[PDB]
């Protein structure tokens, strides 16, 4: 029945509050990213066969996301 | 055997390339033809390939879609932002008039140029006839102008008017200043006697480059050829054969008279005693500044202009703070600079090349007094298409000048004392949504409260859209889900209903005013209700609910789209 009333716990709230968490956000550009110290090191012919552009890579490499559920974001 | 899916409907704009993406534990194998790979199967009726649309005369290789991507040392070559690389017409010739008081020296050239077209069949020796041919070696046009008729007068003089146009449109006004044959004697003067200026060269050039462009306008009608390909691209052999062919007739006509990215350090390295010394490499020479930003630096502006980074140029040879001053010299195509900063006396100094740097009032140290604040980073910043290299120590083997100046004095590198590598804090390219910061100009947002309302606020010089969006978005899984936007007087707008399981977060694309009070108001009268009320000059602004999109720019149309089958 609201805006509020549907990304909330609540919903048989028919009043029309806004929690602090409603805060609007515009897109920026100050930010800074992280690069990672491995990468997955893959080689992908090293011969450049006349029978196909190979790729290959063996060695795993696996990373700890955390996730922000409200902005629904992976990082 | 097909699959029943297709992707109708989507962005047509924009560069497309095959692409793969694999985790790990992987062996892919794409398949081109030619010497690239080899075809298991056939292509479908028509469809050409990617050994075809390969430039001609470019070696094909794989390389990361993405960046960078190479598992290596330290000696990674840090790029900035990249050119268009050019990677997707004829110039106007007749919206001007033709004077008469020329027309007599056009017919001239139309019979240069047509004495010279049956010169070139008279080299190899072509005969006169009645019939039409090129493997016959005959050519029908060996008759004089009293003769030939009109119309293949007319189509022989379209070549020569065209070329005389452009002539004309370049931006000069061009006015007054044996051997054996059935009967035709083609010598108009003398040729290779005179020299042709480099202005008329350049002249002749573009004028090659418009009729090679009016050719393959005309060709592509008529697939995928080496011809095909405009003049700019062409093989250097053609070129030079068509620039002299067309080069010919203003030899006769003169001779009778007539973005950046920033990187740096993590900011938990931020130093506050000693002497710390770091080398940067750069490749290029283009615009590139280097030295040590305290960590509050913003990654849009450029490295330098706020009192929050102490940087160097090298394209402009000065340093870089509130302010400017002339300092040092500038560099070459694959130079090193070696940064000191030295913080128990708080001195900056900067060796290029093993040779320290100089102001005009004789100090070798770049900036003096400096508060310790909470710290310096090594930082850097490549302009468009830069190509450099950090170096924080941990390689003295690698450290050219680092034995040559400081060592001696008492300079350490900045990670020399350290077991695992920097982390290379870069400055990212994908706009993310931030909350708007209290500390922030031109950008205002109140919080009042009978109905809630989040009213708006500015006040600048220089206008701009916004694209404000609200914090946590509605979600619909897995029921009807239905987008209606209603206007106060009546619901006859655009209204959009897909979506199976998505998560579509209210926002407003707004330009910014004088005065712009533009607010969302939560409201009710049946469901969910956002009312995003406007104020005068609402022409322009856009309101609606969004998935995560992050695209800086200024449109409306062309939001990248799709509709799976």
């Known amino acids: 029945p609201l805006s509020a009333g549907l990304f909330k716990s609540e919903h048989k709230n028919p009043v029309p509050q806004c929690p602090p968490r409603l805060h609007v956000q515009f897109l920026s550009h100050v930010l800074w990213s992280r690069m990672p110290n491995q990468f997955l090191k893959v080689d992908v012919s090293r011969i450049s066969e006349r029978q196909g552009w190979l790729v290959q890579c063996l060695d795993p490499l696996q990373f700890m996301s955390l996730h922000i559920p409200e902005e629904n974001r992976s990082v | ?104 020296i056009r017919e001239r050239l139309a019979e240069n140029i047509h004495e010279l077209w049956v010169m070139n069949k008279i080299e190899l020796g072509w005969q006169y006839g009645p019939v039409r041919d090129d493997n016959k070696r005959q050519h029908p046009c060996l008759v004089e102008f009293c003769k030939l008729p009109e119309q293949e007068r007319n189509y022989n003089l379209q070549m020569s008017l065209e070329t005389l146009k452009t002539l004309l449109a370049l931006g000069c006004h061009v006015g007054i200043a044996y051997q054996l044959t059935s009967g035709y004697k083609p010598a108009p003067m003398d040729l290779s006697f005179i020299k042709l200026t480099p ?138 600079v070696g940064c000191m900063v030295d913080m128990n006396e708080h001195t900056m100094m900067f060796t290029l090349n093993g040779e320290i740097l100089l102001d005009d009032s004789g100090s070798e140290l770049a900036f003096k007094d400096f508060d310790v604040g909470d710290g310096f980073i090594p930082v850097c910043s490549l302009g468009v298409a830069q190509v450099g290299r950090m170096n924080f120590g941990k390689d003295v083997s690698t450290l050219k000048y680092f034995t040559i100046c400081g060592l001696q004095e008492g300079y350490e590198p900045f990670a020399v004392n350290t077991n695992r590598d920097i982390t290379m804090w870069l400055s990212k390219r994908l706009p993310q949504f931030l909350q708007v910061p209290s500390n922030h100009e031109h950008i205002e947002v109140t919080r009042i409260d009978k109905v809630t309302q989040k009213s708006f606020g500015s006040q600048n010089n220089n206008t701009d859209i916004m694209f404000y969006r609200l914090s946590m978005p509605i979600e619909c899984a897995x029921x009807x889900x239905x987008x209606x936007x209603x206007x106060x007087x009546x619901x006859x707008x655009x209204x959009x209903x897909x979506x199976x399981x998505x998560x579509x977060x209210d926002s407003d694309f707004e330009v910014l005013m004088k005065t712009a009070h533009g607010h969302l108001v939560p409201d009710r009268i049946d469901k969910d209700k956002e009312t995003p009320k406007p104020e005068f000059n609402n022409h322009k602004d856009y309101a609606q609910e969004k998935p995560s999109r992050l695209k800086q720019x200024x449109x409306x149309x062309x939001x990248x789209x799709x509709x799976x089958x």
């Open chain 2, 199 to 336: 202005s008329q060269e350049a002249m002749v050039d573009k004028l090659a480059e418009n009729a090679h462009n009016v050719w393959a306008r005309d060709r592509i009608r008529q697939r995928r050829n080496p011809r095909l390909v405009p003049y700019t691209l062409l093989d250097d052999r053609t070129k030079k054969s068509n620039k002299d062919s067309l080069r010919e007739a203003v030899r006769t006509l003169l001779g009778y008279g007539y973005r950046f990215r920033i990187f740096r350090a993590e900011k938990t390295y931020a130093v506050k005693a000693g002497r710390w010394y770091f080398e940067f490499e750069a490749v290029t020479a283009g615009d590139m500044r280097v030295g040590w930003s305290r960590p509050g630096c913003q990654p849009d502006l450029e490295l330098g202009s706020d009192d929050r980074a102490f940087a160097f140029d090298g394209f402009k040879a000065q340093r870089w703070h509130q302010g400017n001053e002339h300092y040092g010299r500038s560099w070459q195509a694959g130079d090193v």
């Open chain 2, 1 to 104: 055997q097909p699959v029943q899916g297709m992707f109708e409907n989507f962005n047509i704009d924009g560069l497309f390339f095959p692409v793969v993406s694999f985790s790990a534990g992987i062996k892919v194998r794409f398949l081109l033809g030619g010497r690239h790979g080899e075809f298991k199967f056939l292509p479908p009726p028509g469809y050409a390939a990617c050994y075809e649309a390969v430039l001609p005369k470019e070696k094909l290789k794989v390389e990361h879609s993405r960046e960078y991507k190479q598992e290596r040392t330290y000696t990674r070559d840090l790029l900035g932002p990249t050119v268009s690389l050019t990677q997707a017409v004829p110039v106007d010739t007749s919206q001007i008039v033709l004077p008469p008081h020329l027309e007599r």
